[model samples]
Target: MSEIRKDTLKAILLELECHFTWNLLKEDIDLFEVEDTIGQQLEFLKSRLALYNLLAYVKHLKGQNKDALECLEQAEEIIQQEHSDKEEVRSLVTWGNYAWVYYHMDQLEEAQKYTGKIGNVCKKLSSPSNYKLECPETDCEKGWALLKFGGKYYQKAKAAFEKALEVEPDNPEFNIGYAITVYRLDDVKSFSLGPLRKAVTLNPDNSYIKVFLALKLQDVHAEAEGEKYIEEILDQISSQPYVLRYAAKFYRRKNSWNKALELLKKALEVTPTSSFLHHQMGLCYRAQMIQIKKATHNRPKGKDKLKVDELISSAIFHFKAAMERDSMFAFAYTDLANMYAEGGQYSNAEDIFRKALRLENITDDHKHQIHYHYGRFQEFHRKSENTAIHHYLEALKVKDRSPLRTKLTSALKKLSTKRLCHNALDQSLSALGFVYKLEGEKRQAAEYYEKAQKIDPENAEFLTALCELRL
Candidate 1:
């Protein structure tokens, strides 16, 4: 047993699912003499404190000194915070791991500090009859760790936090973690909002919880109230990129484009690599352009035109930046091409629009956007009514619920009517009546036929057509 080297221990301990001191090979070997300490465990079936200490040891052996230290830190925190009483016994394993890790890292003074904390603790852990009810604090700590593992582990995370709540239901950290995990798993507002509201009430100054609550409010059509909470969060965490993004999204919801733009620009300073942020920034610029154009019609000429042009150029720059950050962001390309067409760069717009369509990674919704923009480009700039109609019809096939859908429908109808009127074979007033009748406009058909009879009082075809219409 004494001849079993450190390398042999490392191999056995660091298996695929690292559970040391818990019957890994109990029939064959006994490594730590922890069996006496193991019997007292209740809530957690395994020796959690000892497991963390051994986990730290494994990390130290693997040359991850910093990670080893972090593991010991968690262990010590759990011992001190979770098992406040009988602290001496609870800290024995954690302090021992700390001493070993620090000594290996060549910090002798720090090593002995942990070694010193091991004083009276070692004597008690030998008998270790401290049968503690697993506290809410420990459960909350475990819940937090699982929550950091993200979306895939949310269900497990929720369970841990909920377990903690059985002991301390009003605990602020536990409530917040429980609410977030519940929200992540299903996003069911009814299930989430109560816990979230309770968390906010318990921890009113917690910015992260406030942000989630505000987002939930937004989901439930409580945008006006949600916007106020977002504003509060922004004031507290203005420089945080994630907070800025949430606020920007809030402002965008209100159609307050300039406000959203300000927040996003500030966010870019913190999270410059975020492609979606740049995409959102570009949307703000584009929206502001339309807003300014609508609100300031018939403004001064020379500088006003230049200002508008500069705004358009700014929108194009951000959209390009978005694609630069993430080359596969298909919606950015569509918006880029739309900006180009708006700026009167027709050739570049057409080339990029084609490129957007050719992108293999683009969704059907993204492709729909390309068609909608191309339709607008053809209608407003190219004067290619037939080509515009083609793109608009393509847009309709994608079946989007956006305002673009209505625009496409209206464009197609207007173009079809224009085509009917422009046909050389149907130029007369009586021909207009026949065309309107075909269009299901029975009132218009009757009106047109009556006008044709007034123009030529004895026109038999017009009178006969009116009688046939059964008006």
Candidate 2:
């Protein structure tokens, strides 16, 4: 093809609705983690054609075009065998993916061929354009793909599912996708309860959706109802690994640590490399340690002390495993660091915390969590009040209204108040003033600032803070 022809081909290719054009950027996701998840899903998901298409896109993102083409071929085979009636509509996404992958490999002829196939499908469907069609299947596929990318794409993923649900309101798969996305987004007001219940009703046999429903019920303090769903899922011995993982989480939140550990161990048997399962297992162990410490008032006798030590070691082991499996598991890193601190390995704890703080592509929420936890670690374990205050302030600056923000603000208040009581230091007074300012108490901030200025009349910082508060 000539230059103009290649350019035209590119223009048409860009119009196709597939993973390549869905803006699933490499920077927003950990490719290896997604690949692992898709790989696991492929093992049990009934309709895996979409999973293969997504795996192909992930492969292409990782520069494995040959592997990507092979995945597309697998997707093509599944469509041919199972989707014979709706072959053209279902194959559109796979074909579009093929075209983009071939185009990236400079195989323009092959790319054009795939694009031509998509064009024929669109024409048959009487779509508005030559290469694009607004089908619920494609929308659901886009939703699922966007979901795998992470929290950054969750809003778009939720919207995509909503579009699909608009067309197929009773579709079990679409309902499940929407429910899961809403659950992940964690919108307190929207509160995934209705969506999850609807999905559970539509997909009565789907143990995975049942687990989500149970979790949402638990979240709303309806554990009595949630326990029914949990017990039902647990009774099914053939549950998938994902179902087991979630069921474990439900038990963990219910404070049934032993039951949670049992489920997590079972899940790890099937997916030994799952970072989520390992993380949950670590949490169970940590919770157990905390429980024992509280019961014994931090002075456990012989056997109790031994049990506490064992729990800490086990938590550290699983947390480390989780971190090693998924480098982008920020919570796993922080959890591991805190476990180290619990084990009295202060140096290792500090090192892991620092590494977590420096991680790239983490959401502001994750940053806030890391800073808050690190601040707690510095305050309690390291005995560095200044460093702790700095981290608490870092967390407070994140502009989130979550309960974590409340904890961050309270931590700052407590520390600043402690310092103020010790001695009326200018810096302590300034910190109290800053905290009050953050809380929108202008009068309190001004009073503290004035006190700070009175203590250090020549301190330019105090004077500036006082002037700002006045203005």
Candidate 3:
């Protein structure tokens, strides 16, 4: 046990790395075999909590809920009861630690509860830069923290980010903070793009800056500026896993799956424990199979079908691998389930999807993603139209409605068409007749496969939805 087994250690290391980019888990869990009477694990964690709060961490580095609560309890025993300015300052660190953990775990109410406590603490220790150095103003850190998570108080968030930028020019985090805040300001006018453009100009060396830009540029193909930003980062950091991710997107857009796969394999050579790279590799394989079908002019039906079967199977395998590596990564499980349903593997799809839902921490922004995939999966393979409908309605309900309200209205009109409404039962079916079939029950399975048909129906996939309705 002293010298860790090679493969097992590698697997654990990979799992540890599966957390999203923002989590700053400095303590090497790779060294600690178990938590039994651990020597400095608690103390080390306390220091980490202090640094995390000080930096105004907008994203929780890792989703360590129970562990974070325990760390807070130990820190509070010393800091909270002591009556002095220093105690209040140190206690805010512990309190903020607890709140942010709850926030990342998607417990908004619990997260907000701490902000209230911090606000009270702020009243006593009004100087924002009390714990920080090189700070220009009192409102710098707290303003950044509030602007970060303040969806309801967007103007407040904007003010905080803007004021912080006043103090720290050319700081990547502050610049990104200011840009994204402006992006949220005016729906139609995107003046926020300017600051982000500056972020790339100043910090061209950071891969994360490129990834941040990519997120700002939605629809992978439309990410032309993102493409340039990524290349700039790659030129600076040639041997990082993120390079492969960006390159994979490039080739993936070009329908060059083989090339995308090659880049992902290169990324693995350096960062073998990265689940993100594995997932992208699987996607390349899956995309390759479909592209093959197109290149062959849809001929050799049997051979092409076999290759697609294998690729889809591999896609599920890698996604499952991602889940096993990080039990807290809910998206991996949800996507694996969706892939199965898309390929008509209903039974396995349903099982994986249910587990995904259970693993998902409750959050307010439901419709924009994760649930959309789940709802669509249910619609495809689990003929429980009613169940599928429930998910879609929930997605719509939880989704922020302003920017997308017009599109949503059009969709509702289709669902509530007097004819379809008469036949369908409730809000669940209110999605559309498409709920009953892969796309809908309006026509035969292959009859209305529009997306593929546009690529030349004869040259594209013709198989329609085929799975037991309730299995």
Top model by lDDT, which number?
Answer: 2
Give a tens-digit lDDT track for model 1, residues 1-471: 222444443332232121222222222211111221111111122235544555565566447889888877866776766656677655554655666666567666675675555543433444232222244654564565455434445776788898989988888878888998876764544578778888899989777778878877887888878878887777766666666666787677677877888888887776676667788888877776776677678353677667677777788898998778766577788888877887678999998888876765445566677788888888888998777777876665664455575566566667756776756322244545655665578887788788888888798877887898875
List model 3 lDDT by residue over 1-471, tens digit each. 223343432332222111121232323121111121122112222223332342223223334456655655655764544544666555554555666565556665675676556566655556453222223222344443444333554677677667767878876766755765666664345566677678766765556455555545534344666666655655544455554566666667667677667677776666655556666777777678667767877553677778877887777777776676555445566777777776677887778767766654433442235556676665556655555555655555566364544444344344345435457333423243233343335443233334334434453122232222222
The lDDT for every candidate, in the order shown, is 0.65, 0.85, 0.52
Q: Give the lDDT of residue 20 in candidate 1.
A: 29
Best by TM-score: 2
Q: What would the per-residue lDDT of candidate 2 be over residues 1-471, giving only the tens digit for each residue?
A: 478877888899889999989999887666767887787667555388889999999999989999999999999999988946888888899999999999988899999899999899889889899899889999999999999988779999999999998998999999999999999988444479899999999988878888888888888889999989988877673436677878888888888988888888877887888887788899899998899999999999999999998998899898889889987788899999987898789999989998999987766767878998999999999987778888887777664466776777787778776776666554456666778887889999888888878877898876777777777
What's the candidate order when arranged by decreasing lDDT? 2, 1, 3
- Clashing residue pairs in all predictions, respectively, total 0, 0, 4
The C-alpha TM-scores of every prediction are: 0.46, 0.82, 0.53
Q: Which ten residues in a row have the lowest lDDT in candidate 2?
A: 420-429
lDDT of 3 at 296: 76
Model 2 regions lying over 4 Å from their true place: 1-8, 187-190, 235-239, 361-365, 392-471
lDDT for position 343 in model 3: 62
Q: Candidate 3 has which clashing residue pairs, if any?
A: 23-61, 147-157, 389-428, 434-440
RMSD of each: 18.9, 5.1, 15.3
